[PDB]
């Protein structure tokens, strides 16, 4: 995934359709989602457990 995804401060819709479940972490890969204050739509598709 791009490492600059969280630098898009004007992003409105985010569509993740991968597998965010990494090794024994609470989805640390998307821990930068708090940066996007303009986010309106989120479409995670990664077979979430928690």
């Amino acid at each position, epitope marked *: 995934i791009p490492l*600059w995804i969280y*630098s898009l401060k004007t992003l409105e819709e985010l569509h993740l359709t991968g597998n965010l479940s990494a090794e024994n972490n*609470r989805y*640390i890969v998307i821990d930068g989602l708090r940066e996007l204050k303009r986010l309106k739509v989120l479409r995670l598709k990664s077979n979430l457990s928690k």
Partner: nanobody
Amino acid sequence: QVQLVESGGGLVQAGGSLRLSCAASGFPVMNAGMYWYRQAPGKEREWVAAIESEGTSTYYADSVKGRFTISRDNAKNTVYLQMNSLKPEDTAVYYCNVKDVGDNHFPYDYWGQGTQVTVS
């Protein structure tokens, strides 16, 4: 240049209070999101503390929620994290992290060297 360096690492038996710190170079800390991650032997990096830019709102994981205090000081251009009698099971190597500062070059996330705090 952009780099993170932290201090305050020291083995402390349960019953005291430790004060952490950091040091950000090349960018203001006010207009940037700072993060605290913990590293353990045989365990991956776990998020601990996050302070949101443009509004100064603190975010804590349920593992350590309601137990620490994190603040940003622009006078020293650093972030202070203070613990409250951290448990022996909380011993970890804390990592500083700030990602996507106003400057946008190839390194998008910056980490510190890492300080080991021991509790027994």
